[PDB]
């Protein structure tokens, strides 16, 4: 008998099951694929590493600003080993991790019918709508197999599809992205996405808008064609990328004999994350909190740490699902936390609501030989509410804005104000202290 | 008449000048060389443009980890025509400012003897002690002279020679820096240092120790010996560059027939920046505050623009010397906030302290093809003081140190904890997330 079996060893249940190994509980784990699942295998790791390599390619084609001579070609084949060299290492670790704590390990497909808590902790997996052509498209994840290609289009403007983008055409190969709407990351800050857009169509990724795709032909093997319902069509695309959303692994866990209640196929909890029926509990983006979703490793992590605590030692510490910091690894990436500044005012009206921003060149491109006009920029977004000038959000576009955010963060949460941030004595030089002097 | 005259077109007279502008003061400023003075054309605009210089560098000796087949030369004179080329366009920026905003710009050296309110604005300038030899050196300045050389020996080990040498050898420059102490940086928490002094000396940087030099020689021209009080001798330099700090440029401002104060040059001021003369103001590193002296860009850019209000329009806004945020642009670089560990237990007492401190491999180098070991470390320490754990120190060594502080720093301000810390969802994968996971 176990005190808590884990069912999932991604990102949630491995930190829960490890947690409460560490109270002394009786765990075990079950997982089928690889460990570490989604954020490992297919999502924040290699896509991070992609990530990188784009950034080494731009560092590359640039060098002779800095006073280098350089003369290179890339090679994705190598990318491909080198990274999936990295990824093989990591499962051998998480499997380390598993038995220095004393955790029992479990390799198999989990199903309900020894323990005495059980975790449901098995996120999603990708969702392909009822279009024509689908068949002849693939997901996020298969992206990680291609080592070869000459133009690659995307389905969707969320942030997968963005950072993929960007990472693709910094590999060489031809770019487009479609979006339903007006312009691409309809749910962040209008102003940071103008300055997005812009940089992207100077590095000749192509973005369409008002797109619905509702064809996708196969004229051969690698010869691909994307319909849209207005008139415009989009020929030769080896593959086509369909980053639609994501979908609970709950289909057959021989749960409903079991009035685990279900949204759509998302499994409900409570502040603490337990299901309609006890002992049985769900932390990981395969459920959903009342309703909050949320869909990051860092959160999945918490959620499991904090319940083994209820578990385990004591209840006191809940999860926090508002204010959750984010960084879209675009080109150049965001970091964005809180609100926008049209969040803002839904929610507490423009009379109430003052905005600074900032728009600057990071010293990087100084030596650039080029306008200045022309140099790929650094905006940033303060949004306040209220009368001392609480920052209900914080927003920054540029090189090494997925670093400066985390920091701002603890100040969020700490309900700071344009006066902390006044008051606080800037770093020389950085791109950061622009937060400080946005007078 | 004027209402105030700027003595220094440095850092702070600039930022007071056109601060005091702004609130409608007849203001002046004299100037007798170009704009922007140490920080823009000797200091942290260069210094930071070399930086990144070496980090091009080491991108382009590494790329072929990322699947790039990468040759590259590289070539000094050029980073310096670029380098400099930039800075001729700052001069020009900053002089057009100065008649956006009214301030009657002057040419020519200063000295006292038409204005109501005058303020001194003239930093430092370098220090050679009385060495034999040191008619053979050079100085921090002169460096960026500097287009042709094999050997360079750095006499010092404050933060400007340490960024230095470590700009120098990934440069192609070998390299060799001279320390009275154990360790360089010996005012800055040990257990970072320990891991600066590692990876510098694991990229071939001779970091010598207990070192006091009693001549410089010159066998001939750029064949230059460096002799040590304890018997070691070291030859071949083409420079010897001397860091030993910097003076006052308070020599002849025609002053003492004013019985303005003087320690040692630096000109005594109050809370308010005032002089022992009213009418009589004086901010930049030229001055020392009580005493606190501080040489950094952004404080001489907070005192002048302070200081125009109380001249302007209300006197509530005074300059905070305590928690000044700092980056070693070193390489690693190193953000420092606060207390060290052991100034922490000079001032509270060890019973009282409680060190939180992490140690990993960024992912930028999964895919470096090397054993784990021996890759670029990051790590970081938390330094708290109490009971409910107030963080009194902050600081950390890696691949974007220098901007995953700022933030931090905003929260220091606001007298966060470990708990404020540990409250904040992390950001995933960054570097900076670590700090939230200290457990
Ligand atoms: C391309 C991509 C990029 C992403 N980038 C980021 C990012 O940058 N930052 C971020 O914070 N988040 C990112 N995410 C979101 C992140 O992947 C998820 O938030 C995270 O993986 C959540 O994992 P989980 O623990 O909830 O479930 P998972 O990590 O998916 O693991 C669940 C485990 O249960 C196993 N399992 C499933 N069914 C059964 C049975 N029956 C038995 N075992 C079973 C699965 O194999 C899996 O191992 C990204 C996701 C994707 C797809
Ligand atoms: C190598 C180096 C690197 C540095 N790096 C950093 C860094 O990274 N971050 C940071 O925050 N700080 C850095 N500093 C410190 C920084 O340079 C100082 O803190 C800053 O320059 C202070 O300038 P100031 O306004 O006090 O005086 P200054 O900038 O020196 O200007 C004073 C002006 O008055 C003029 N003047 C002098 N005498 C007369 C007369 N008589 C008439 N006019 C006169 C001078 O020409 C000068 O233009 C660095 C300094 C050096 C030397």
């Known amino acids: 008998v176990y005190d808590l079996i884990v069912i999932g060893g991604g990102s949630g249940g491995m930190a829960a099951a490890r947690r409460a190994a560490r109270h002394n509980a009786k765990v075990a784990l079950v997982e089928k694929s690889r460990l570490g699942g989604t954020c490992v295998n297919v999502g924040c790791v290699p896509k991070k590493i992609m990530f990188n390599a784009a950034s080494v390619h731009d560092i590359l084609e640039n060098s002779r600003h800095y006073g280098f001579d350089t003369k290179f070609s890339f090679n994705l084949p190598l990318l491909v080993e080198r990274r999936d060299k990295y990824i093989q290492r990591l499962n051998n670790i998480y499997r380390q991790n598993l038995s220095k704590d004393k955790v029992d390990l479990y390799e198999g497909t989990a199903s309900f019918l020894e323990g005495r808590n059980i975790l449901i902790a098995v996120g999603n997996k990708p969702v392909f709508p009822p279009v024509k052509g689908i068949e002849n498209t693939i997901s996020s994840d298969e992206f990680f197999n ?174 926090n699902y508002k204010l959750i910091p984010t960084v879209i690894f675009s080109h150049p990436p965001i970091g964005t936390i809180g609100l926008s500044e049209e969040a803002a005012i839904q929610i507490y009206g423009k009379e109430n609501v003052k905005i600074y921003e900032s728009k600057f060149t990071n010293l990087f491109f100084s030596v650039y030989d080029i306008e200045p006009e022309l140099k790929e920029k650094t905006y940033l977004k303060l949004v306040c509410v209220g009368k001392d000038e609480l920052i209900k959000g914080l927003h920054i576009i540029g090189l090494n804005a997925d670093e400066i955010v985390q920091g701002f963060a603890v100040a969020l949460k700490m309900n700071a104000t344009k006066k902390d941030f006044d008051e606080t004595i800037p770093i020389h030089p950085t791109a950061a202290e622009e937060f400080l002097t946005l007078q």
């Open 146 to 319: 291609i080592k070869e290609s000459k133009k690659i289009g995307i389905v969707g403007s969320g942030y997968i599809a963005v950072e993929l983008i960007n990472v693709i055409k910094r590999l060489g190969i031809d770019s487009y992205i479609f979006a339903r709407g007006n312009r691409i990351l309809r749910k962040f800050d209008e102003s940071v996405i103008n300055v997005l857009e812009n940089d992207m169509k100077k590095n000749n990724i192509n973005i369409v808008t008002f797109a619905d795709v509702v064809e996708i032909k196969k004229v051969s093997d690698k010869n691909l064609s994307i319909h849209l319902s207005d008139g415009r069509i989009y020929e030769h695309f080896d593959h086509v990328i369909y980053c639609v959303g994501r979908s609970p692994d709950t289909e057959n866990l021989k749960l409903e004999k079991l009035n685990v209640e279900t949204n759509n196929n998302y499994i409900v909890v409570d502040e603490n994350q337990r299901t309609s029926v006890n002992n049985i509990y769900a932390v990981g983006d395969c459920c959903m909190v009342k309703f909050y979703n949320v869909q990051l490793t860092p959160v999945a992590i918490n959620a499991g740490r904090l319940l083994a605590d209820r578990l385990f030692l004591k209840k006191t510490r809940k999860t």
